[PDB]
Every structure is written in C-alpha cells, then in structure tokens.
C-alpha cells in the first residue's frame, strides 16, 4: 500500500495473507467470506506467462494477523474462475480457496459480506470511496503493520482513457485524479486483497473489489483496477453450492 496508514487492531478482521508454503514467502492478500472460504485474485495462483501455477498443497493462509491470535490454515482446494483471462487483461481475476478446517471467529477474525444488487447499485458510484488493505510494498518496502488506504471509485471513461489495456465489465478502477491533491494506491504484494465499502443502510462492510492490477503504483494519471466482485457473484455462489461443506 502506497500513501496509506497503519491499521487499527481488528479494523479489517477479514484480512487474509496468502503464503507460499515452501519456501515460505508472502504472495498476496485475500479475504475471509465464511469460516471455510477465502477470496483472492486468480493471478495470485495462476499466471502462465510467469510459469505460475500454485495449487492447494503449495499454499497456506494466515488469518487474523496485524503485526509481522493469528491462525495458520491449510487449503483443501482452490478454484479459479474458468473464464479467467490471463492472456489479455486479467478479465475475471478471481479465485476461491477452501480451508481444510473451519477457522474460529474471534475479535480479530470475522468475515466480510458479499454485495447484493441494491448495495452494489447504491455504493459502486464514481467518487464514492472504498478501503484497500494489504502487506505490499510502500513504494513502486514491506511494512511492520497492515496498511490501509481509502480511495474513490473513478468514472469508467476516465479509467479507460488511462490505460491501453482493454477494460471489461468485470473491472472497475479507483484512486485519486492528478488534480485532487490526495494520493494512494495498491502496490506489489497487495494483489488479491479486498476493496471494501461500509453500507449506510445496515452498518455492514461489503467487499466490492479485489486488488487486480495497475501500471506502476500511485502514478499521476494511473489508477488501480479491481475485480468487480458483484458481477461475478453467481460464479462464487456456484462454487460454494457445489463444493461447500
């Protein structure tokens, strides 16, 4: 996270860290959506141009962490969106990971909500701010504490004009414009972590996005791109209904 701040204790209890098992290395962010299911970006697990293809036995997750009470969980299975497009633009950059055992909820471990249509329509508007959290680099180093930054959703024509990559309906972009004075972005290591928004209608936090990709970090005129979680919710429900516990 660039231009963020240290998270308060329990501020993001759905935060999950995705690690390579051996050799141990922090790979990505992720999020807890139930006591058995973790959401992340597909490109954290599968990216053929870099010969990346992690499956469940390659991985572990750390849940409830704040500093570098926390639970290490093994993975039973991972599920990558079957129409994930790594060749062109990371379309459908989403994956589910099933824990081998249910994680116990606590003050530090608690799941985030997935949006329904009314919540998505209400909150996913240009200028409305979401919250991004991660253990990624501070500039285009690693932090001692989970980092947090709030960023406004950007109008789609502005997102499109900012990159030569073809943008799909399964992405949105966020961040401050050059004339807005404030800064902030996700960066290397934040991929797969959540973009969350707090509903004024029921006081609940909803995961609207997944840190997916960007050009550099916090560049003037560039924006971070996020997987459109709501639009892919039917795939999420299909996986959980078919392979749930």
């Amino acid at each position: 996270i660039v231009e963020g701040s240290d998270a308060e204790i329990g501020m993001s209890p759905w935060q999950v860290m995705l690690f390579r098992k051996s050799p141990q290395e922090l790979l990505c962010g992720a999020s807890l959506i139930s006591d058995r299911w973790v959401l992340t970006a597909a490109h954290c697990l599968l990216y053929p141009p870099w010969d990346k293809n992690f499956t469940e036995n390659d991985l572990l997750v750390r849940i409830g962490k704040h500093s570098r009470i926390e639970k290490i969980s093994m993975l039973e299975k991972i599920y990558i969106h079957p129409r994930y497009n790594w060749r062109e633009n990371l379309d459908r950059d989403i994956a589910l990971m099933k824990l081998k055992k249910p994680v116990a909820f606590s003050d530090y471990i608690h799941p985030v909500c997935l949006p329904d249509r009314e919540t998505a329509a209400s909150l996913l508007q240009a200028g409305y701010k979401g919250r991004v959290t991660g253990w990624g680099n501070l500039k285009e180093g690693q932090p001692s504490v989970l980092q947090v930054v709030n960023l406004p959703i950007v109008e789609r024509p502005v997102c499109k004009d900012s990159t030569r990559i073809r943008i799909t309906d399964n992405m949105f972009c966020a961040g401050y414009k050059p004339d807005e004075g404030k800064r902030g972005d996700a960066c290397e290591g934040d991929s797969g972590g959540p973009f969350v928004m707090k509903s004024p209608f029921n006081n609940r936090w909803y995961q609207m996005g997944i840190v997916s990709w960007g050009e550099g970090c916090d560049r003037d005129g560039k924006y971070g791109f996020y997987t459109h979680v709501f639009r892919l919710k039917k795939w999420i429900q299909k996986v959980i209904d078919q392979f749930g516990e």
């Binding site: 290397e188 960007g214 050009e215 039917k234």
Partner: peptide
C-alpha cells in the same frame, strides 16, 4: 453519481501488478 461498473451479472504485459 455514475456507476463505476455495470450492475448486472457476468454472462457466458497486462499491467504492472
């Protein structure tokens, strides 16, 4: 005011991140 992405369901060097 404008939606940042469509409110409907999916029917069926990429960045520096």
């Amino acid at each position: 005011g404008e939606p940042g992405a469509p409110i409907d369901y999916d029917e069926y060097i990429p960045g520096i991140r």
